[PDB]
Amino acid sequence: MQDAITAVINNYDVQGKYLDGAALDKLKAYFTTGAVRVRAAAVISSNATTIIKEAAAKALIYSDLTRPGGNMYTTRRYAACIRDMDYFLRYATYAMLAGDPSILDERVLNGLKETYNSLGVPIAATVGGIQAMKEVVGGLVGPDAAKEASIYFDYLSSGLS
């Protein structure tokens, strides 16, 4: 995938330019942010199960979806939906460490709309769930991390919608 360090490198490589101070400064900026990111990632991993639970409670469950004839009705479908939620969370965590939204595009975002349409999964509900996870995540990670975390969640949401 691509990360901030590699993104700078790639931009320079297409130009053919050797790395310069301005480029170095961007790299330096990333290095400082890194420590914060690692702490945030550890928080998310530990609380992943709860984050999903809370988000589902906020948006998915106690709804027509869970009621018979709904997309999340039946154990199989319910389990699938929470598995998808976990995917989104894991990838967002990866993106946050990376400092780049590209991984989301390469793995999660590509073909998702089409997959969902064939499946008949409701996109808007999924987006709702992602937004819910974001809110929960924001609390756990704390303020400095929150802003960074939010952008990746929003990126996923925009892609799906």
Partner: protein, 48 residues
């Protein structure tokens, strides 16, 4: 105050702008002969 804030953050404000019918529809100008009653107006008409 709460009832006019977004429930969800809107963390990348640009995404939420430029949703809907695109702005082009509203931006464009209409041209008529009734406006033509001037030498410059007429030139705009014709270009249009």
């Amino acid at each position: 105050q709460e009832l006019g804030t977004p429930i969800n953050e809107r963390s990348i404000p640009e995404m939420y702008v430029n949703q809907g019918v695109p702005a082009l529809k509203r931006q464009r100008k209409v041209f008529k002969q009734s406006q033509a009653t001037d030498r410059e107006s007429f030139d705009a008409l014709v270009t249009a």
